[PDB]
Every structure is written in structure tokens, then in C-alpha cells.
């Protein structure tokens with residue numbers, strides 16, 4: 001993902017493309033002044049075009065292009081394909097960024113003893129970091145722990161010289177960036193004169209906190225670090241380009257809200273017992289999310305033609321609780337089509353039958369008590385929690401309403417013996433959906449253990465993002481997750 005440049009200006013972008021690129025060269029970059037705006041900058045015919053990519057919380061919307069779950073999936077699509085102003089714009093040659101500050105292992109500011117302490121306390125064999133030299137202004141230091149799991153372990157420091165914007169460990173190959181240097185010694189470890197192999201197995205973990213000390217961390221990230229932690233998470237999304245072939249089948253194209261926002265094959269919900277008189281009846285744009293007790297299905301808002309599939313899914317998976325994350329309509333646009341009957345009414349949805357027994361309004365949500373059964377047979381109650389007050393852009397300014405909602409959703413789920421996964425949906429089913437599920441996982445840990453458990457917010461998101469594309473869309477959602485955790489801890493504290 002070296003084609004993303006976190007700290008580049010528009011003019012820097014043009015200059016790089018003109019001086020270091022050719023026709024078909026391209027890079028992506030943030031706007032500083034605009035929080036979820038991105039720019040795809042592309043060279044064509046000796047000039048540079050800039051293409052806006054907007055993300056308000058639900059998807060990356062490329063101007064004159066499609067909607068995507070991640071910038072990595074966006075770039076892969078166009079590099080393997082179609083993008084137009086109405087002339088075609090080709091993405092051929094990624095223009096690679098040398099900037100180290102979005103790498104997990106980069107801690108510019110760290111001193112020598114502080115890096116030793118951190119590796120001593122948090123680190124294990126093969127834990128490493130790169131820091132700026134304090135003794136040699138402009139050089140870097142590689143600091144690596146090796147040993148058993150005393151004096152059976154040690155920290156080694158390797159000096160990294162910077163000569164003419166190339167990095168080296170004192171001999172051999174000179175690398176054009178610290179990333180290229182680290183990737184080379186990750187793959188081909190340095191061996192000390194006396195045998196020790198300085199293996200670079202994992203970056204030092206600096207994001208795992210004890211839950212009690214959330215307020216400390218939020219304060220620090222608020223000085224921001226929030227943006228820096230988030231971009232470092234985003235850099236890792238290139239590890240998550242898993243196959244989505246079932247969703248790409250012609251038979252399944254019009255079962256997807258957005259043609260290119262698709263379920264990973266390895267976690268998609270497979271529907272059995274379908275209409276035998278219809279070719280592909282096993283597909284819904286939905287994934288199982290298994291925290292790595294309570295599981296989830298993350299899915300899109302229904303289309304007219306997928307409402308029947310949605311109820312087949314709820315019934316098959318034994319789900320008893322549905323969370324809806326959007327109004328039916330927002331900004332005059334359909335965000336989640338109505339798939340339930342009016343209050344007191346009864347409807348058939350293919351082979352499934354649903355009664356709406358009772359609706360109950362709360363401040364931030366409406367609860368619908370639905371009864372689901374198969375025609376001709378099986379009845380169970382499905383409790384649908386329809387969150388109604390999420391703003392149309394951005395995130396809520398206070399997390400109390402979301403937390404009070406998830407607390408109630410949690411207790412409903414826990415009250416029903418052997419209930420299946422909690423269904424969480426609407427819109428594309430990645431942004432708000434991913435935000436609600438992550439908050440839910442984190443608060444669950446804390447509810448079971450207490451204020452003195454360890455959480456790792458970015459680790460948790462990456463784990464959920466490995467099970468559905470782009471779960472948690474924006475920096476604002478990312479910040480909102482930390483705020484919700486912070487707030488939960490305070491209400492529990494006393």
C-alpha cells in the first residue's frame with residue numbers, strides 16, 4: 001500500500017508524478033482540511049488529474065467511479081480493469097511513498113532507554129521498533145528483543161545511517177526508505193558475530209491498554225495521535241484482500257447494494273434449502289463475524305429482491321436479535337428498505353412468515369417484536385432494534401445513546417437460550433455496522449472482566465476487517481469507538 005502518501009500536499013503530489021512518475025503513475029492522499037476526503041492523483045498524457053474520493057461513514061465514493069469498501073480494494077479493482085473523467089484514466093504504476101510514520105514499528109520520538117523499557121515490559125522474542133537517533137541527528141536505530149519467551153533475553157540496537165536519503169546498517173545494500181530496509185531484514189535476518197539471529201517477528205505493541213487507563217490514552221491520542229493510529233490501521237488493509245468470488249457471480253450481481261462491496265468467500269453466510277427451481281439460491285451479501293461466545297452477522301440493507309433471502313438467513317442461523325443502524329430513508333435516499341410488516345400485521349416473505357406483534361418507541365430507537373416462522377410449519381420471536389438517531393454524516397457527538405442501546409441489545413440476546421448470531425445491518429453494512437459490532441465486542445470484554453482487562457482497539461478492528469471488507473470506515477468512527485469505551489468505563493467505574 002505504498003501508493004498512499006499520508007502527509008503530501010496537492011502540489012507535492014503533482015511534482016512527484018511529473019518528476020518521478022510517467023503516464024499511468026498514480027498515488028492516493030488525504031485532505032488535511034477535510035477529515036474523510038481523499039484524492040486519487042493520476043498522471044495521463046504528461047499532466048496530473050486529481051479525483052475526489054469521499055467517505056462520510058458508509059463507503060468510499062470515487063467521483064466518476066464506483067463505491068468501495070477500502071482504498072486497497074478500489075486500487076485493485078482499477079488496476080485489474082473503466083475509470084473515466086468521459087475519457088479513460090488508467091492506474092498503471094503506483095508511485096511509492098517512503099514516509100515511515102504509518103508503519104506499526106515506527107516510533108520516531110523514542111529514546112534509547114525508553115525503547116529498552118518498552119521492549120522489556122511489552123515485548124517478546126522478535127519484537128522490534130525503529131526510532132530516531134538522538135546522538136546522530138538524521139539517522140535511525142533498530143531496537144530488537146531476542147530470547148526465551150533470568151538474562152535469557154536481551155535488547156540489541158542496530159544503527160541505521162541515512163546517507164543521501166538512503167538507509168543502511170553500515171554495509172551492503174542502501175535502501176530508498178526505512179520500509180524497504182526493514183522488509184529486507186525481516187526476510188533475511190542479521191546474524192551477530194557470535195550467532196544470535198536478530199529476527200524481526202512482530203512490531204512492539206503500543207496500542208494494547210488496560211481498560212482502567214482509557215482516559216489517559218484518549219487524552220494523549222487527543223493531542224492528533226488519533227489520526228496517526230488510524231492511518232497505521234488503514235495501511236494494514238492490503239493484508240485483507242481476500243477473495244470475494246461468489247459475490248462477483250453474474251447470478252449474484254443484483255443481490256448486492258453496491259456492485260464492488262462484497263462478502264469475503266471464507267466468512268460469507270451460505271444459505272441452504274433454497275428454491276430448487278432457481279440456479280444460485282445460496283448467496284446473501286452478509287458475513288459471519290466471530291470475535292477472535294457472542295457472534296454477529298454483518299450485512300447490507302435489503303434490496304426489494306433480497307428481502308426473502310434476508311429472512312431465510314435469520315431463520316437458518318437462529319438469530320433472535322436484529323440491529324438496524326440507519327433510518328429507512330436518509331437525505332431523501334433509501335438506506336434500508338422496509339422488510340418487516342406494519343404493527344399488528346402479518347406478511348409472507350417467500351417461505352417465511354413474519355408477524356409484527358408490538359412496536360415500542362424509545363428515545364434513540366424503536367423496538368419491534370417480530371414472530372418468524374416457516375409457512376406450513378417453527379415460530380420464534382425476533383427482536384429488532386432500530387437505531388433512529390445516528391446523524392446523516394459523521395458520528396453521534398455523545399456515545400451514551402448507542403451504549404444504552406447496545407446494553408439493552410446485549411441483555412435481550414443473553415436472555416434467549418441458544419440464540420444465534422446478532423444480525424447487524426443497513427446501508428452497505430460496513431461503516432456504522434462495523435462501528436456497532438466493534439464497540440459491542442470491546443464492551444463485552446469489559447462487562448465480563450471489569451475495568452482491569454486489556455483492550456487493543458486497532459487489533460480488534462483488524463480482526464473484524466479480516467471477516468468483512470472495510471468494517472469501520474472512518475477516523476471519526478474510530479475516535480467514536482474509543483469515546484464509547486471511555487464512557488462505558490466511567491459509568492461502570494461507579
Ligand SMILES: Cn1cc2c(Cl)c(-c3c[nH]c4nc(N5[C@@H]6CC[C@H]5C[C@@H](N)C6)cnc34)ccc2n1
Nearest residue numbers: 101103104106207228229232233236458459462
Ligand atoms: C494484527 N494487528 C494489526 C494491528 C495494528 Cl494495524 C495496530 C495499530 C494500528 N495503528 C497503530 N498505531 C501504532 N502506533 C502509532 C504511534 C506509534 C505506533 C506506530 C505508528 N507510528 C502509529 C501501533 N500499532 C497500531 C495495532 C495492533 C495490531 N494487530
